[PDB]
Amino acid sequence: SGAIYVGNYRVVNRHLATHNDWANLVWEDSSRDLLVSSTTAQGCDTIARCDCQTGVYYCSSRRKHYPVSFSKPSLIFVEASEYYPARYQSHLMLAVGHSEPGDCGGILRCQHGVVGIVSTGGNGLVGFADVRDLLWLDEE
């Protein structure tokens, strides 16, 4: 589990979005595994605006933050997980590391701020849903 809290937005994995998220929906994209809802209180996070390929991510199933190198966001085939069938996921970055289903929502961060959240795992990789192209998160 986990979210990004930027401005008056809450960014979550689409598959973990709550009824309250859907009732306060700003934007959602199944192909990216992302959903954004509106918040009453302002959040503590800053979104990275950059093309970094190194950062640190939180792994809940290890209680640890790991430094990783990761691929630029692309269209990637993802094998079946407990929460999605085998399918293409867009705007996905991969790194070598540990990820189980419950690790979804852990932040990946670089020197510029939050890059994305954990969205995929298995076979020794961790996949992250990018948010650095969602420039509208920084206003309004």
Ligand X SMILES: Cc1noc(C)c1C[C@@H](C)C(=O)N(C)C
> Where is the binding site for Zn(2+), in residues?
50, 52, 110, 112
Residue 136 CB contacts under 8 Å (≥ 6 apart), including other chains: none
Q: Is 8 or 53 the residue whose CB approaches Zn ion more closely?
A: 53
Residues linked to residue 57 through DSSP beta bridges, in sequence order:
66, 108
CB 33 within 8 A of CB 89: yes
Q: Of how many residues is the chain composed?
A: 140
Q: Which stretch binds Zn ion (CB under 5 A): 24-32, 39-47, 81-89, 108-116?
A: 108-116
30 binds ligand X (CB under 6 A): no
Tokens of 86: 């085998």
Q: How far from 52 is each of 5, 19, 30, 91, 108, CA to CA, in Å?
A: 21, 34, 25, 14, 11
The footprint of ligand X on residues 48-107 (CB under 6 A) is 73-75, 90-91
44 catalytic residue (yes or no): no
CB 48 within 8 A of CB 113: yes
Of 65, 112, 122, 125, the one binding Zn ion (CB under 5 A) is: 112
Of 1, 22, 50, 80, the one binding Zn ion (CB under 5 A) is: 50
Closest by alpha carbon to 116, among 43, 34, 30, 9? 34
**Measured from the CB of residue 51, what is the shortest distance to ligand X in angstroms?**
11
15 catalytic residue (yes or no): yes
Of 48, 92, 107, 131, the one binding Zn ion (CB under 5 A) is: 48
Binding residues for ligand X, per CB under 6 A?
73-75, 90-91
**Residues at the interface with Zn ion (CB under 5 A):** 48, 50, 52, 110, 112
Residues marked active site are found at 15, 33, 104
